[PDB]
Ligand binder design. Structure first.
Ligand SMILES: *[C@@H]1O[C@H](CO)[C@@H](O[C@@H]2O[C@H](CO)[C@@H](O)[C@H](O)[C@H]2NC(C)=O)[C@H](O)[C@H]1NC(C)=O
Ligand SMILES: *[C@@H]1O[C@H](CO)[C@@H](O[C@@H]2O[C@H](CO)[C@@H](O)[C@H](O)[C@H]2NC(C)=O)[C@H](O)[C@H]1NC(C)=O
Ligand SMILES: *[C@@H]1O[C@H](CO)[C@@H](O[C@@H]2O[C@H](CO)[C@@H](O)[C@H](O)[C@H]2NC(C)=O)[C@H](O)[C@H]1NC(C)=O
Ligand SMILES: *[C@@H]1O[C@H](CO)[C@@H](O[C@@H]2O[C@H](CO)[C@@H](O)[C@H](O)[C@H]2NC(C)=O)[C@H](O)[C@H]1NC(C)=O
Ligand SMILES: *[C@@H]1O[C@H](CO)[C@@H](O)[C@H](O)[C@H]1NC(C)=O
Ligand SMILES: *[C@@H]1O[C@H](CO)[C@@H](O)[C@H](O)[C@H]1NC(C)=O
Ligand SMILES: *[C@@H]1O[C@H](CO)[C@@H](O)[C@H](O)[C@H]1NC(C)=O
Ligand SMILES: *[C@@H]1O[C@H](CO)[C@@H](O)[C@H](O)[C@H]1NC(C)=O
Ligand SMILES: *[C@@H]1O[C@H](CO)[C@@H](O)[C@H](O)[C@H]1NC(C)=O
Ligand SMILES: *[C@@H]1O[C@H](CO)[C@@H](O)[C@H](O)[C@H]1NC(C)=O
Lengths: 778, 778
């Protein structure tokens, strides 16, 4: 028992376990010398006022005779300054009078002290520490109740049989941790836990929250308060080497603390902080000297509990009045940084309490203090139930309660499994199967007092714990300032929600949290910013310039009343009117009715075989063979060796061949798709070979017959040598049919049939000239 | 202290911790009743003879006065039947007299017993148990030395400061575990560990061994002795649902035991067993009732240690002589299954020792027994060093040894850090930084005694521990029988080493342990069975039928002396000889010298323009134009309107045009690659247009000139109307040059130039007929 032992007598010893220092030295006893304990080198005024709260509620339960009359209460309280070694050293001293069943050597002077047993005990802060000692207490079923350890591992009543707590489990915390960025709607996030049993199981639970919500986890590192500076350099190189503005820290204070100093030295700004409440209310972190990089820190916290007499008991302090305190004197000379002694001067003992800004007194709220304060009263209330035994009707084997003069900690734990009673602020606080309770969490922001530069902890909503899943959250969205000041929401996806036409693909190797969006052209119709694929639009439709919705058309190659064709139709109509005036002058002065009608019919069927494409407008290509063959038969049968009925042995033979090709030809336009951008066309789908066959067998045959007959008439001037102009009209016309063999066989595009139509029309006009002009010039 | 407490007095208490039962019951005290200890329901005769070995070496060290004269040795030995709860209950009773520094209430009658302290202690079997108690003993620096716990975690002297052992670390075990299948050269393997701190760190170390050796791990499951039958069904569904004949089990006995029963019920055969030595010497596993599926089990083991008096002390047993034993009576009535009492009858106490086949006595070897037996002697030897203090020159702060009448366990541990002494079988057994030693491992096989059906454990090699990495292994390959009997090696890759031409690719999604081999055709040259890709072979070479090495050629289209061309050359030579006899008869009876030489030169240049392709053999196509144009000029200039020098105004004009085309033509064969399989060709790379230009401007021009001149001579019989046969020879020849316009313009393959050559040759023969026959038939 050190001078840090905190003890006063009483009928039930309690004992408590507390971090008087955050840090412990790591000196190495090297065993040529005798070993000894190691110094613990930090402080925790929050822990010291937890002690003050402990003995305060001790004083309440002793003084207030409604709370257990005629009974005084022992305690032997020790200083677990985050060292499980010292914790073990403590708890062995705890289970000594409880270990008197195994003690079998010291009979006649154990009664020389006759010290009773510690029937239950306050638990501890650190989860690893409490799990260390829970293994010891599960032997003896000593009821131990932690005030701060809140891991899901301790719910295992197989190993940790004898353990309850006064704090909710971490699972709703990890739940709401997923839910707040579910609200904040992000994809690329990175987390940090601590290297312990508070960091690892909580981050595993939260990792499964994230894998429900499908968030590409950028990193997951573990830390301690005794970490390597090279490892800290490694993880800050990770932090500088990643794309995650959001940072989940799921640690305690002193574990993030060297990382905090390393960052405020290293000075990376912009990354923002989800906060574990183990450090989210901690002025060693919450420093103005740190606030140049920390701000907008968002954490849960327990609601503030209120204690009558709290600050009063805090200021009821004196070093000479330390009748039962362990570290009052060190506390006095440490707060005041002097050296009272029974350089650093002799302390007055009378220095003003609020002359210093101590976190013993600098609080705004009471949370784990409050948990302690209610925890001891829950112990007192189960013991009050034991005090008020129902007479043979208790919770025992046949209800026989133990007497208060001879109690049993297993029976204590039996009553502790079932407790149902109200709080000092009127909350019916029961104990579930985990042996805890659960309240809501104020979700806070880390703002600054503009009057003083003091970091103020400003709630921007709260997480209810009583609604359904997906129903337990409140957001005060109004007081939200992202990164402390900026009311606008930042970005923690990996890729952007891209542009419209960029079809949102994926990236192989990388999770689909981060992906690509492929710029899909040429009929995509992709106007949604996150369309995964494209849309193949309709056949008359082609995409916009940004590969957007399709409005643009394909080709429209018809050329019905085109402006190029208007002048050619004017030339054709002029030739028709000139031929009409010529025929009028000739009739006043077969060549006027039949041959002139065949020539003007091949010149009017050339006009009718232009225009738009249709079925019959496609099928109309026959009369340019027929009427022109009749006009050519007029030339081949107006010879001097003298025809309608008699040279119909040729002409009607070609006419029956024309009826055969009329039966054989296909009467249907063909709007083909030759190209793809300028796709549509008109092709007229002609049947097999009837056009070239009729051309060779009629027109070229008549030209050859006229040449073979007029081979003698060329060297024979008859009717002023009309064979010369006859063979010249045949030269123009056979030049058409044999040079637009190559020209209309070497045509292209929407002028292909137009070229043959112009060839036939010009050949008609030229034959009309070289025949009728030579006929009727005089 | 139970009746299982094992105690006799003496100046230094030792204490030991042992599994009297494998299994402990899991009854649930439900706290309406008073709690109590839980029964431990199994047995371990190997542990009971470990006790016998313990007290045997105790007896040695007491009796043998060379080992510590004038000093008696206490012990208080307890029964850690694999229950860490009972272990904790034990070790608290251990550190009680050592905990007398904290004991501050029992002064005047602690001396009523005056019990001294337990200065050191035997460790424990289970790694979890020893790590539990090592946390307790690191407080007091009580030197604890395990006999069976062998995990690498305990080498951490930060937490486990006060711990040494008598067993090598698991790292060489995992090393050799990689090395044996490295020898056995496999790729797809699956492992099984246990759900503890012996299974998990060992399988992590071995997993990193495997990831060095790059073996696709099929599965990794964890087990315990208290596992769920649904989980056992899950992992046996994994075992039936995988492709891994090799199975690494890295557990203890009772963890694999329910899996062993589940498998021998479930009856899957064929899978083979790498073995952790914690169960590889265990007759509960090594059952003949199990040997129907277990066999060929290959495990390491520690070498056999030998103890004088071993079996002797084993048979020095009696229940009434149990002057210090804990479980002798239960052992007696459990071995004999009777009920001696101070139904199951009253035991005689005189039953024959080897009347039963008990694994207390059924051994072949002594291993962990031997570790215990040497461990206590190492303790005795460090204490013998303490007994022989060097007078002020010890290992202390200035060498002042502690007296033996007042000792200190920290000083004990200081001397225990440095020990250097020989074994009973003469091994200088020191203690390293882990505080252990390391010997080789007999690598055994699980064969069967054919005389008795007894499972015999047959070494097939050993793993040395003193050579280098990659040097520490011996294999007796001769006694290797895979799966117990089969001397041939099995298969534990995933894919096969495939066929030759199948180019060994990979599989996306699956590790390259298991992969594909793509059947690569068409010039692969892939004759290696595991070639990753193919080989593009030479241009004259094409792959075999199995896409193997390329030997097959491409095309060889040359046709120099082909058998089809031999008969045509015979026809040409026959026409030449007939023309020679015809010219001889005509000269005896320009047409004989010049025109006949031009015709026979176009008929001999047709022969010279056949054969193989070369540069000049390509360039030779000019003379078929030249000499035939001279022969045609003979026909066009032997007219009746009468030539060499005068019609050279045409003929020499064409000859200068022929010299111009001779300058313009390219003289080079072109072995092109038209196809790819039958690739090679011959194309002769002719220059631009000189052939068609010379043809039209000379041959067709001369034919037109002859027709336009003989238009009158056709209707004119002169020299018996030779214009008829003249125009008939021109009909054959212009039919050649104007129909092999289409035929030699519509040719294909290696007969393309052959067709034009045959056309020119036949045209020469036909012109020779239709001229010279009509000339000289009479
Ligand atoms: C980060 O990624 C998530 C996933 O797409 C985005 O959440 C989407 O938000 C839009 C509206 O903002 C909703 O219509 C979608 O239904 C959400 N997706 C899912 C899967 O629910 C989020 O918006 C992204 N962040 C930013 C800043 O755009
Ligand atoms: C925790 O959150 C609950 C919300 O489920 C709070 O409930 C409030 O209850 C009062 C009276 O029952 C209502 O008037 C309020 O409207 C409720 N608040 C809501 C619905 O947001 C509850 O007070 C909170 N605190 C505790 C300790 O339970
Ligand atoms: C299982 O896979 C390994 C990996 O390829 C094979 O080991 C190869 O064995 C051949 C000869 O057997 C050696 O030439 C190679 O060098 C080995 N590979 C490596 C990476 O070293 C093994 O042979 C395969 N098993 C079977 C049965 O073929
Ligand atoms: C462990 O293996 C070593 C091999 O490194 C054994 O060494 C033998 O040593 C003797 C004498 O020194 C030699 O004659 C043998 O040839 C060695 N065996 C070999 C090289 O295989 C050693 O005996 C083994 N056992 C122990 C306990 O160390
Ligand atoms: C840290 O970085 C921020 C980023 O702008 C900068 O404003 C600030 O001055 C930096 N501080 C130090 C100490 O480098
Ligand atoms: C009532 O209590 C007695 C004594 O404790 C016990 O023997 C008895 O079994 C109990 N009765 C029942 C019904 O449990
Ligand atoms: C027990 O708890 C229920 C629910 O909170 C409550 O209604 C009841 O009054 C409680 N009983 C006692 C005795 O506290
Ligand atoms: C188990 O399977 C093996 C496989 O052939 C078979 O030989 C053996 O008879 C089976 N045993 C039982 C009990 O099903
Ligand atoms: C020798 O031993 C004495 C007493 O133990 C000690 O005071 C002294 O420092 C030692 N000398 C040295 C050099 O360590
Ligand atoms: C110490 O160990 C070394 C190496 O085994 C040996 O040579 C030496 O003899 C040992 N000394 C003693 C005193 O055992």
């Amino acid at each position: 028992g050190p001078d840090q032992r905190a003890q006063k007598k009483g009928d039930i010893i309690l004992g408590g376990l507390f971090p008087i220092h955050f840090g412990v030295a790591a000196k190495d006893q090297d065993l040529k010398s005798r070993p000894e304990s190691v110094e613990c080198i930090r402080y925790n005024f929050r822990g010291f006022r937890w002690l003050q709260a402990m003995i305060f509620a001790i004083e309440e339960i002793n003084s207030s005779p409604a709370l257990l009359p005629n009974l005084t209460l022992g305690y032997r309280i020790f200083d677990t300054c985050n060292t499980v070694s010292k914790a073990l050293e403590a708890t062995l001293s705890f289970v000594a009078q409880n270990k008197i069943d195994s003690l079998n050597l010291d009979e006649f002077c154990n009664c020389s002290e006759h010290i009773p047993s510690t029937i239950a005990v306050v638990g501890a802060t650190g989860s690893g520490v409490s799990t260390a000692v829970a293994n010891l207490l599960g032997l003896f079923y000593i009821p131990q109740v932690s005030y701060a350890s809140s891991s899901r591992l301790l719910s295992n009543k197989n190993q940790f049989k004898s353990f309850l707590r006064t704090i909710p489990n971490d699972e709703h915390q990890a739940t709401a941790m997923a839910d707040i960025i579910e609200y904040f709607r992000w994809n690329w996030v990175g987390t940090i836990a601590a290297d312990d049993d508070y960091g690892r199981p909580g981050i595993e639970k939260f990792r499964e929250e994230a894998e429900e919500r499908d968030i590409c986890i950028d990193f997951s590192e573990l830390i301690s308060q005794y970490s390597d500076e090279e490892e800290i350099q490694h993880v800050v190189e990770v932090i500088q080497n990643s794309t995650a503005k959001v940072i989940v820290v799921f640690s305690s204070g002193p574990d993030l603390e060297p990382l905090i100093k390393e960052i405020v030295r290293r000075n990376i700004t912009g990354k923002i902080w989800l906060a574990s409440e183990a450090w989210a209310s901690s002025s060693l972190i919450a420093m103005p000297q740190y606030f140049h990089v920390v701000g907008g820190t968002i954490g849960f916290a327990l609601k503030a509990g209120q204690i009558p007499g709290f600050r009063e008991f805090l200021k009821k302090v004196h070093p000479r009045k330390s009748v039962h305190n362990g570290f009052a004197k060190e506390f006095w000379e440490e707060t005041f940084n002097c050296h009272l002694q029974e350089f650093r001067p002799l302390c007055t003992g009378d220095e003003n309490i609020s002359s210093v800004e101590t976190p013993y007194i600098d609080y705004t709220h009471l949370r784990i203090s409050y948990n302690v304060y209610l925890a001891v009263y829950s112990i007192a209330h189960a013991l009050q139930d034991i005090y008020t035994c129902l007479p043979g009707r208790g919770l025992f084997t046949n209800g026989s309660c133990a007497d208060i003069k001879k109690v049993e900690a297993w029976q204590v734990l039996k009553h502790l499994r079932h407790l149902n009673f109200t709080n000092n602020m009127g909350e019916q606080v029961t104990f579930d199967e985990c042996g805890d309770l659960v309240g809501n969490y104020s979700i806070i922001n880390w703002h600054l007092s503009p009057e003083d530069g003091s970091i103020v902890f400003k709630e921007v909503g709260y997480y209810n714990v009583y609604a359904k899943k997906g129903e337990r959250l409140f957001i005060n969205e109004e007081k939200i300032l992202w990164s402390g000041f900026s009311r606008e929401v930042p970005f923690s996806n990996c890729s952007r929600d891209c542009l419209a036409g960029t079809r949102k693909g994926i990236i192989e190797g990388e999770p689909t949290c981060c992906f690509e969006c492929v710029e899909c052209p040429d009929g995509e119709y992709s106007d949604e910013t996150d369309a995964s694929a494209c849309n193949k639009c309709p056949d008359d439709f082609w995409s916009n310039e940004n590969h957007t919705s399709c409005i643009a058309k394909e080709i429209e190659f018809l050329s019905w009343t085109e402006p190029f064709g208007i002048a050619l139709t004017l030339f054709a109509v002029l030739g028709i009117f000139l031929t009409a005036f010529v025929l009028g002058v000739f009739i006043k002065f077969e060549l006027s009715y039949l041959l002139l009608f065949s020539l003007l019919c091949c010149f009017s069927s050339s006009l009718f075989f232009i225009g738009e494409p249709q079925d019959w407008t496609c099928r109309l290509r026959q009369p340019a063979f027929g009427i022109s063959f009749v006009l050519c038969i007029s030339c081949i049968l107006v010879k001097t060796n003298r025809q309608f009925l008699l040279v119909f042995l040729c002409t009607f033979m070609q006419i029956v061949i024309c009826v055969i090709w009329l039966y054989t030809a296909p009467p249907s336009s063909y709007r083909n798709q030759e190209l793809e951008d300028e796709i549509i066309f008109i092709t007229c789908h002609e049947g097999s070979l009837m056009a070239l066959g009729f051309l060779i067998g009629y027109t070229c045959l008549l030209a050859a017959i006229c040449f073979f007959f007029a081979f003698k008439s060329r060297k024979l001037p008859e009717n002023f040598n009309e064979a010369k102009f006859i063979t010249f009209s045949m030269l123009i016309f056979f030049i058409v049919w044999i040079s637009f063999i190559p020209a209309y066989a070497s045509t292209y595009g929407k002028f292909v049939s137009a070229v043959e139509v112009i060839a036939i029309l010009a050949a008609s006009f030229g034959l009309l000239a070289c025949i009728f002009f030579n006929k009727i010039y005089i």
